[PDB]
Amino acid sequence: QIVLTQSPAVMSASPGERVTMTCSASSSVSYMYWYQQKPRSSPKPWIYLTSNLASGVPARFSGSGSGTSYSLTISSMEAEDAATYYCQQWSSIPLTFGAGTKLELKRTVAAPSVFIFPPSDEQLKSGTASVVCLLNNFYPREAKVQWKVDNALQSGNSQESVTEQDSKDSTYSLSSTLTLSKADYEKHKVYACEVTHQGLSSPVTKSFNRGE
Amino acid sequence: EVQLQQSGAELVKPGASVKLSCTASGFNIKDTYMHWVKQRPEQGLEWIGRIDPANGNTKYDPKFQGKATITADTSSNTAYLQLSSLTSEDTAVYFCTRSRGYFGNYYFDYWGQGTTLTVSSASTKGPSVFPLAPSSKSTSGGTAALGCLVKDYFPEPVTVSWNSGALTSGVHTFPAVLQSSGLYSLSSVVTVPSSSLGTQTYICNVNHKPSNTKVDKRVEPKSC
Ligand SMILES: [Cl-]
Ligand SMILES: [Cl-]
Ligand SMILES: [Cl-]
Ligand SMILES: [Cl-]
Ligand SMILES: [Cl-]
């Protein structure tokens, strides 16, 4: 089976920049093919027979290569080009795809805005208390959230997730949920999430006191 | 116009079998090759195999021999993928896609919308929906964040809209997280003008189709 190795796995570019990514085959192939895929949707044909653009693909895209080395280029990046690009070969069975190059949007550092939400009274009636910490519109993606209850760090009782890059402003947002029993929630006073991010000169803590 | 219409989401216990289907319109599948492609959560595309509906000839990636069986019926213009003795490794999105071979320059030129398969014996479970109320702790620059916590459901997905789709700007609906209980939770937040809190109603509309759960939750300000 012909292994297709795509480099880089992940890269980031500003609108207007030239972008090239490569696809290397373990043995020679006649033509290379490419597909674009965005989150939660089907892949789209993008380039076929190495250099022919599929219908609807704008002229800033091109494809090149021969033998074992192929590449896809964007002459001048647009925000809408942020996506994963897969190469694929038809010269040998089984058909194989590369593992993808994820093209992300580069922008300037942006510090998160940090907000905290106590559990609802509704949820408290049910015996559980979820506290939510929101980090809105930051860049780059890496961010550290630390939950403290009466100033004691919390380990192993939270879950967090991060949106896809926002295509309007190229930032990320992050939501973290601390989940305690109602018993443990009612036995402590101060609930705080502490955020570390490269956009902040020192960590930011948002907190509230239960019942106030 | 060419369309590939795939069958709906499947939740199936491990060890059982499942049949996915892809109904073509705007062309005859006998003139094409009908392929299936697998994409596991957060992973790349994997080719499973294909059938030539003109003669029934199939080819499979050896990885999927015995797991996958591909058939096609030309009278209904439908291709099928049957998977046997399901495991958690079969949980994935399955795409059907066509190729026209040599005379159509080979590439996968049309793709179905995908079918999600979740392999689990668990019952479906609808979410609880709790407000994330706006307050002085969620305000910045004359705006206020509020939201809904959509907790403890199975399987994916839920959809969240705000004010029945009239509110779309400044919404962030976060990816679901898997909890240690084995159930999912997600939050959806929206940032709005602080001035609007006393004068604009905000409702999150939550749908969990697997359990037939629809919840509308009005999110009200909290004066701490
Ligand atoms: Cl799609
Ligand atoms: Cl269906
Ligand atoms: Cl899995
Ligand atoms: Cl059920
Ligand atoms: Cl979901």
Residue numbers in the entry:
A (entry chain L): 1 to 212
B (entry chain H): 1 to 224
What do the study's own words say?
Fab460 structures generated from individual crystals using several different conditions are nearly identical, being characterized by relatively flat CDRs. The top of Fab460 reveals two positively charged pockets contributed by VH residues R50H and K59H for one and R100H and R98H for the other. While SO42- anion groups from the crystallization buffer occupy these pockets in the Apo structure, the latter could potentially bind acidic MPER residues in the Holo structure, a speculation borne out. There is no significant overall conformational change upon peptide binding aside from a slight widening of the binding groove associated with an increase of the Fab elbow angle from 138.5° to 147.6°, perhaps consequent to different molecular packing within crystals.
